[PDB]
């Protein structure tokens, strides 16, 4: 009834080449709605097209987003992370070391130091098991506007939040459309669901 695909188990390991790395991920996740395993998105370059992720609705293991220069990770359809397996034994979502510091300037496509600015998870409502680990993302905004209490399942015994808020740039406020000022990005289509 849903499009199924496997995940990966590479963790923080450095890929053979950026050419094979993105091509493999595109081949794996394009069309996929249910990842039966771990969604790992690592070492992705600044201008990497990630539109193949648009259909992903659930991840059965953990989500790892690490060492990316890509400015935005679009997982706007991701509704649920199960935490059937965990990162560092405790975490269902881990966002780590994503890029380089940048000031308040809106990025210039070929000049501006790369790094994750926003984790676009508008549909995320459920984390069944495991916590959230967000560390060392200089350009990342909006982790601290999110109410993770509403996302953690009531049975989640490992509902941990280890969230670093340190930033190189100031965050633009959520759009007024996001009631309660909780959002994943600066757009009105980025509010917490």
């Amino acid at each position, epitope marked *: 009834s849903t499009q199924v695909c496997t995940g990966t188990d590479m963790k923080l390991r450095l890929p053979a080449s950026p050419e094979t790395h993105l091509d493999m991920l595109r081949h794996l996740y394009q069309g996929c709605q249910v990842v039966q395993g771990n969604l790992e998105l690592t070492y992705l370059p600044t201008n990497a097209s990630l539109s193949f992720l648009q259909d992903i609705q659930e991840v059965q293991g953990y989500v790892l987003i690490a060492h990316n220069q890509v400015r935005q990770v679009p997982l706007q359809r991701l509704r649920i992370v199960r935490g059937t397996q965990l990162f560092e034994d405790n975490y269902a979502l881990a966002v780590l070391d994503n890029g380089d510091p940048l*000031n308040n300037t809106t990025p210039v496509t070929g000049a501006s130091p790369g790094g994750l600015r926003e984790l676009q998870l508008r549909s995320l409502t459920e984390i069944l098991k495991g916590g959230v680990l967000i560390q060392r993302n200089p350009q990342l905004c909006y982790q601290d506007t999110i109410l993770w209490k509403d996302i953690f399942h009531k049975n989640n015994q490992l509902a941990l939040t280890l969230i670093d*808020t340190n930033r190189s*740039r100031a965050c633009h406020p959520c759009s007024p459309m996001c009631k309660g000022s909780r959002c994943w990005g600066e757009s009105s289509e980025d509010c917490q669901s």
Partner: single-chain antibody
Amino acid sequence: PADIVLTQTPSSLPVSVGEKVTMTCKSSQTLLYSNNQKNYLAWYQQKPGQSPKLLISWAFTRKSGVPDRFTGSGSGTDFTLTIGSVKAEDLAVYYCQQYSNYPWTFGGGTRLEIEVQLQQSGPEVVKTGASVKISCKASGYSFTGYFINWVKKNSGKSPEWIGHISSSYATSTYNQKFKNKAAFTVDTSSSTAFMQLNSLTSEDSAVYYCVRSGNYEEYAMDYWGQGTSVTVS
């Protein structure tokens, strides 16, 4: 990415107590951000002998405690500050300020005439060619959650944004004019920010401020330090 110029009118406004007053701030670029429909414009008040204080950020949002007789209005490039009924205490210079693009800039000012703490180091009297290191001690808030902006203020001139530093990531942005003049450092442990000024000439003689700014709704500069006078002989 051109520098934004803020034009303030009138540059001086004679008033009597009880009068309604309107001052204009016009921008060379729109300050409206289309993603959040917010205008990145603030107003500041500097009374004689005192450091500037935030009145309004966001074109029309007053800082907590500011009298409702002060009203900010306008959008895009056109902005006004109105005082419904002027008090004797309102006699000061009012500066509009943009935080939309680098460098952050101030208007020429309108002269009106008839917990969180930032402790700066004492006055500096130095010679030509010498250096100076101004300290800024922060208290009453989480130091790494905020930026430290540095501002130059001369008698009878509008404030100049020297630049700012991210406390947590030690990321410094400078006004082009101060690139080979000022250098920022921070110490997370002692909640102190530093600015070193080198190759000091007479043009570098002024009052210097450290100013806090934050994130989200607190994006604008809010709390100013008491100031540090540097005189170069």
